[model samples]
Target: KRVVTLYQGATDVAVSLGVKPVGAVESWTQKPKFEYIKNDLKDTKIVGQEPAPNLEEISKLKPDLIVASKVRNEKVYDQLSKIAPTVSTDTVFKFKDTTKLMGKALGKEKEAEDLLKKYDDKVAAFQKDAKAKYKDAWPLKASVVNFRADHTRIYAGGYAGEILNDLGFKRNKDLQKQVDNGKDIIQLTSKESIPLMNADHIFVVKSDPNAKDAALVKKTESEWTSSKEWKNLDAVKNNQVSDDLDEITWNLAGGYKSSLKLIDDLYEKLNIEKQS
Candidate 1:
């Protein structure tokens, strides 16, 4: 079965299911270096992104199935469906559901369940490790932000946010309550409250080259980092503020593997024990 996926979560789902798809849409940050699929991706075809996919190129591949998240590209799915049977999802960040959907599309339901089990086991191990060190402090307050000086979009809930939530971390109550729909994301319009970023840990996603000139990036590294609000935070004072360039922190495929890496990074950096 020739399968092509559109986003990071779907690509991760494909990887988790042990299906190296025939084609994948490259992300501005993840393309050319999606670590999990790197070895096989050279052989796979590349489909352009949404709002515009290389339709002629995709049609040429004669893909049997196309998996895409409806949230990112709903309008184009109609056109894409014409080329192949498309299983479009309005929700892609939920890896568990996406795995089942992709598995069914690929005729591998049992395999998806087994993979889910493996992830669950890994989660259990992570929890145990957190417990060993944190004991009564297993739940840490955490927040992740995708930088933007525009004060428009906020990176609340997606791959990285979900991983932190799953690991038993609590979102700041103010931040959580600010999200209109209880979604993991919340947007703020003023720089005055940037201190809201203060948490037990702050994972900041650096802008991609496409957004290299964004004022937010400049501000964060320069003025923002030195702000009294930033310096006063416990996490920041202790240097628990982790900032990653677009690749390792927010890469489409890399985000999937980051759960394990996050744990490792935390334990190594914080000198905490790895749970069972």
Candidate 2:
């Protein structure tokens, strides 16, 4: 059955399962397709952006299934359902559940299970190695941040945060308190809140180079780094801040393959030796 994915996560899961979606949304960073999935999506049609996908363009694809997210496309679910058998997940960040849902929807449940097992095995191995190498730092306090033109976001409970948690890393105490107090997955802040981004280690996912406001993002990052508050961060002082990670796989798309790549990158970034 031909599928059309309205989000990058679903599209990635579909591709990982050896099912090429007939259409997918244009990635936030890359047009038409994300760099990681570009080869697989070479023949896939671009169905517009995630926030407001072109229904007409999707309709033209004539998909047998439509995978979407309730968080991003609930308002348009009814309209999409009218087009095909639409399977929607509660949120885009629940990568594992989304993969299973898509697998069932596409009749590839076995493939999905296998992919998830592989990812889980890798994660377990990485965690074991990290525990052995870091010892006291086994459950290191970490923060995942994104810088934008007008504001910054510290992720407390999204895909990246969840992955960090699975890897046995703990969230910064302040951010965890916010989550305990019923805050959203991300904490929005201005330059004044730079101190709130402090942690034992920080994984920074910068703005996309292809964004319309890339220059502004750069300016914002520059200003933030030059500030006294940013300089005071433990991660910054200890050289634990890293912006060299894969933005597309870690921050943009959430799927089995991307998650595995993220884990691999983290191992290399932290110099964690593999367990014999």
Candidate 3:
């Protein structure tokens, strides 16, 4: 069952189902492929980047099945069909859909369900412990603030936001109202707008510290956050900002395996008890 994955999530799902794709798209960072999945895909051919995978290289592999996403490849769906039995995920960020989509297409429905079960089960354990530990503070309102090269935005609903929500964390109610119940994001331009995204805790996602724009990004973040407006935030006063997080796993690659690693990182970074 030679397969071709046109997106990161599908490539991860294929490995989750005990199948390595014959070919896959290049990763956003770590080059060629992400470090987490590179070993599994060591022998896999790189078709191209995510947004525009080389169709010629894809068909060259002569794959029997092709995994892609509507967000990225819907325009090329017809073109892909000519090469193989292609399946497109609703969106690359929704791992549950990707799992179910690939599982059914690959005849591994039961295995896919099990993977989801593991995540759900861990959430249950985390919720039980956190409720007892944090009591009134359980389900603390959380928000993700991302630093961009040109601007900053608060992500209420996206890949990481959805997973955090699934873990029983509440979105900053004020921020949630601004977006579509955590399905959309809002940008920040003025330093005065900093307080708008204040929450019980904040997950900061700037680009890689070693990236080309690293200095500019850090300077911009410092300028905004070091202002009097930022020091006034409750979460910041209480030291609730998540400091150590992987940019790739937490922000970029929203796959099942990445979700699990995000969970593991939460346990280490947050003050919650471990799953027994």
Candidate 4:
């Protein structure tokens, strides 16, 4: 089947399901390459990326199925649906129900179940290990802050936020309050708010190369690194900060691989032992 995906997260799910799509949105970090998608990615075509898709171009491909996520481009769904059996599932960062739905669509329900089971098992192992080593720190509070050159945003119940939450880490009450109230979590008004990101641990999602240049991520990082408040934060002082954007920071947000990596990063940085 000629399948096309529009978002990287959806494409990540499709890849995890043991099927490589015919086409996918190009990743922001790198041009279309096999390393991210495995060998199958080598032959897959990159149709187009975010903000827009070449509809006329995709139409020529005559994809049997076109998959998209609601999070990125809601306005384009109606137009895209006309191209093929388009399945625009909800955000991969929100409900994971898309996995089951996609599995059913691809006739791989059992495989999906098995894949989820494997992820669950990995979560159990990491939780057990984290709890034992940090028994005094049963539930670690964490937050992920994304600082673009132009603006800053805090995530909650989304991709990165959900991952930290699922790993027995608690979200800051203040941050949660803002998100619940329809407020921007990061609130990028001034560099002063940088310290407000304090938590037992903090994960910073760096911008992709292109975004880095446009957003001036280096300036943001430089200001953050030199900020007195940031230096004073317990998490930062103790070296409990991680700045990765790979599957652990991106793709495996809801999967075992990312969870394990998160735990290992923490264990190594915090000097805790893996219980299991």
Pick the TM-score winner. Answer: 3
Better of 1 and 2 by lDDT: 2
lDDT of 4 by residue, 1-276 (tens): 677767665666677777778777776555654244546566677787655767776777788888777766688788788888888766645425666766777787897788777656766776787788768977877777776676665555566566566667886676777667754345566766665577888777655655536548677777767878889876899888877544334433333234445556655655666552
Flag the better candidate by TM-score, 2 or 4: 2
Q: TM-score: which is higher, 1 or 2?
A: 2
Clashes (backbone N, CA, C under 3 Å), per candidate, total: 5, 0, 0, 2
Total backbone collisions, model 4: 2
What lDDT does the true structure give each of the candidates? 0.67, 0.84, 0.84, 0.66
* lDDT tens per residue, model 2, 31-126: 667777899987899998888989998898999999989888989988999999899888777789988998899899999899889988988998
The sequence of per-residue lDDT tens digits that candidate 3 reaches over residues 121-205 is 8878777877877888988888888887667888777788888888888865577777655355688788878887788888887
| lDDT of residue 42 for candidate 2 | 78
Model 4: clashing residue pairs?
129-275, 154-186
Q: Which ten residues in a row have the lowest lDDT in candidate 3?
A: 176-185
Scored against the true structure, residue 98 in model 2 reaches a CA lDDT of: 82
The 10-residue segment with the lowest total lDDT in model 2? 182-191
